[PDB]
Design a binder for this molecule. Structure first.
Ligand SMILES: CC(C)(COP(=O)(O)OP(=O)(O)OC[C@H]1O[C@@H](n2cnc3c(N)ncnc32)[C@H](O)[C@@H]1OP(=O)(O)O)[C@@H](O)C(=O)NCCC(=O)NCCS
Ligand SMILES: CC(C)(COP(=O)(O)OP(=O)(O)OC[C@H]1O[C@@H](n2cnc3c(N)ncnc32)[C@H](O)[C@@H]1OP(=O)(O)O)[C@@H](O)C(=O)NCCC(=O)NCCS
Lengths: 313, 313
C-alpha cells in the first residue's frame, strides 16, 4: 500500500548512506592492503641486509676494545627483535603445511588481543576434547570390550591430533614459540593412532588394548593439568611473582609428565616383547612400538630441555 | 671497525623511517578494523529490517495495481542482493565447522581477485591429489594385492575428503554457491572410506576390493573432466558464448557422471548381496552399502537438479 512504500523509502534513504559509506571503506581496504605489502618488503630487505652486517662483523671478532665491536651485537639483537614485533602485525604467508590444508588464505591475527583470544580458544579446545577423549577412552577401557567403539576412539584421536597440527600451525605463524618437537609429536601420535585402526582384532590386540587405552586415559588426565598451567601462564603473562607461579605449576606438572614419558617407554618395550612372540602375525605390533619409542625420547628429552632453559632464566 | 658501524648507521637512517611508517600503519589497521564492524552492523540490521518489510508486504498481496505492489519485490530482490555484494568484502564469521577445525581466525578473502585465486588453487588442489589418488589406486588395484597399501589408500582418501570439507567451507563463506549436497557428499565419503580401514582383511574384503578400487580409480578419472570444466567455467566467468561452452562441457560430463552414479548404486547393491551371504561376519559390509546408497541418491538427484535449473536459464 501507500505506507508500505513509505517505510520502504525511509529505509533506503540511508541505503544511499551505506552505499556511500561502503565506497570509502573498500578504498580504505585497498590502500591498507598496499601499506601492508609496502611495510613487509621494507622490513624484510633490511633484515636480510641486517644479518649481512652481522656476518661482516662475525668474522672479525675472533681476529680483532674487546667489546667495542660486540657493542654492535646487542645493537642488532633487539632491532632484529624489533623487526619481530613489527612483523607480528603484518600478514605472514602460510607454511608448507597450512598451504596444503587451507590453501593461501590468511590466518594471522593482526592484533595482540586477537592472538591472545585465539590461544585461549586453543587451550579451551584441547580441554573440551580432553573431556571427550577421557569419557570415550574410559568406556572403551572398562565399560565396553568392543572393536567398533575402539575404532571410534582412534578416529577421534586421529581427528583430534590432526586438528592440533592445524591449530598449532596457525599459532606458529602468529607469533608462538612452540618448540619443533611439540608440533611433531602430533604427527607421530596421528600415525600411531592411524596404525591402531588397521590393527586386526585378534590375540595381540587384546594384549595391548588395556595398556594403550589406560595410557590415553592418563594422557588426557595430564592434559587437565597442562590446561590449568598453560591457561594460567597466558592469563598471567598478559597482566618475580610470575616465576613463583611458573615454578609451582611446573613442579606439580613434571612428575605427571615423567610418569607419562615412562609409560610411553613401557608401552614401547611391550610392543617389542609382543613381537618376539610367535602368536604375533601383525606388523602393527612393531609399527606402534617405534612411535611409542619416538614419543618417549622426543617428549622426555624436550621437557628436560624446557626445564634446562627455565633453570637458567 | 669504524666503517663496520658506518654501514650500521646508513642502514638505520631508514629504520627511523619504517618505525615511523609502521606507526601510521597500525593506526590505519585499527581504524580499518572499526570501519569493517561499523559497515557490518549497518548492512545486517537493515537486511533483517528489510525482510521485515517483505513479510508486511507478503501478507497483503494474496488479499490485495497488484503488480505495483509486486514491483516492490524486484526493488528488494536485487537490493538484498546488493547487500550480498557489500557483505562480500566484509569479514564474515566461521560456521560451526570452521570454528571447530580452525578456531576463530578469519578466512574470508576480501578481494574479488583473491576469491578467484583461491578457487583456482582449490581446483588445482583437487587435480593434483587426483593424480595421486589415481596412481595409488591403480597399483592397489592391479599391481599390489596387499593390505598395508590398501589401508594407505583409504588414509589418503580420508585426508583428501577432510581437506575438501575445510576448503569447501572456506569457499562457502567467501561467496560460493555450493549446493548443500556437494559439501555433505564429502562427509559421507570420509565415513565410507573410514569404515574401509576398520574392515578386517578376509573373504568379504577380497570380494569387494576390486569393485571399490576400480571405482575410486574411475572417480578420479571423472575428476579430470570436472577440473577442465570447472576451471574452464571459472576462467571464462571472469572474462551467450559462455552458455555454448557450459552446455558443451556439461554434455560431455553428464554421461561420465551418470556412469559414476550408477556405479555407486551397483557398489551398494553388492554390499547388500555380500551381507545375505553366510560367510559374511563384518558390519562393514552393510555400513558401506548405505554410504554407496546415499552417494547414489544424493549425487544423482542433485546432478539432475543442476541440469533442471540450467535448462530453464
Ligand atoms: C613444560 C611444559 C609442560 C610447558 O612449558 P612452557 O613454558 O609452556 O613451554 P615454553 O616455555 O617452551 O613455550 C613454548 C610456547 O609454545 C607453548 N607450548 C609449550 N608446550 C607446548 C605444547 N606441548 N604444545 C603446544 N604448545 C606448547 C607454550 O604455551 C608457549 O607458547 P607462547 O610462548 O606463544 O605463549 C611442556 O614441557 C609441555 O607442555 N609438555 C607436554 C608433553 C606431554 O604431554 N607429555 C606427556 C605425554 S603422556
Ligand atoms: C554439473 C556439475 C558437474 C557442475 O556444475 P556447476 O555449474 O559447477 O554447479 P552450480 O551451477 O550449481 O555452481 C555451484 C557452485 O559451487 C561449485 N560446484 C559445483 N559442483 C561442485 C562440487 N561437486 N563440489 C564443489 N563445488 C562445486 C561451482 O563451481 C559453483 O561455484 P561458484 O558459483 O562459487 O563459482 C556438478 O553436478 C558436479 O560437479 N557433480 C560432481 C558429482 C560427482 O562427482 N559424481 C560422480 C561420482 S562417481
Amino acid at each position: 500500500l501507500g505506507d508500505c512504500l513509505r517505510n520502504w523509502e525511509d529505509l533506503q534513504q540511508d541505503f544511499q548512506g551505506i552505499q556511500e559509506t561502503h565506497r570509502l571503506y573498500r578504498l580504505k581496504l585497498e590502500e591498507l592492503t598496499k601499506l601492508q605489502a609496502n611495510c613487509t618488503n621494507s622490513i624484510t630487505r633490511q633484515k636480510k641486509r641486517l644479518q649481512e652486517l652481522a656476518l661482516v662483523l662475525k668474522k672479525c671478532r675472533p681476529s680483532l676494545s674487546m667489546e667495542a665491536a660486540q657493542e654492535l651485537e646487542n645493537q642488532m639483537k633487539e632491532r632484529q627483535g624489533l623487526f619481530f614485533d613489527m612483523e607480528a602485525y603484518l600478514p605472514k604467508k602460510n607454511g608448507l603445511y597450512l598451504s596444503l590444508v587451507l590453501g593461501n588464505v590468511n590466518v594471522t591475527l593482526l592484533s595482540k588481543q586477537a592472538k591472545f583470544a585465539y590461544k585461549d580458544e586453543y587451550e579451551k579446545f584441547k580441554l573440551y576434547l580432553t573431556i571427550i577423549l577421557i569419557v570415550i577412552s574410559f568406556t572403551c577401557r572398562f565399560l565396553l570390550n568392543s572393536r567398533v567403539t575402539d575404532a571410534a576412539f582412534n578416529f577421534l584421536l586421529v581427528w583430534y591430533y590432526c586438528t592440533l597440527t592445524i591449530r598449532e600451525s596457525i599459532l606458529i605463524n602468529n607469533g608462538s614459540r612452540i618448540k619443533g618437537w611439540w608440533v611433531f609429536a602430533a604427527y607421530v601420535s596421528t600415525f600411531l593412532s592411524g596404525v591402531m585402526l588397521t590393527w586386526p582384532d585378534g590375540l595381540m590386540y587384546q594384549k595391548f588394548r588395556n595398556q594403550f587405552l589406560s595410557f590415553s586415559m592418563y594422557q588426557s588426565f595430564v592434559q587437565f593439568l597442562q590446561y590449568y598451567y598453560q591457561s594460567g601462564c597466558l592469563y598471567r603473562l598478559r597482566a618475580e611473582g610470575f616465576q613463583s607461579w611458573m615454578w609451582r605449576g611446573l613442579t606439580f606438572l613434571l612428575p605427571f609428565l615423567f610418569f607419562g614419558h615412562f609409560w610411553q617407554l613401557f608401552n614401547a618395550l611391550t610392543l617389542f616383547n609382543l613381537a618376539r612372540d610367535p602368536e604375533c602375525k601383525e606388523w602393527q605390533v612393531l609399527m606402534c612400538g617405534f612411535p611409542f619409542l619416538l614419543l618417549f625420547l622426543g617428549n622426555f628429552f624436550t621437557t628436560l630441555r624446557v626445564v634446562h632453559q627455565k633453570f637458567h632464566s
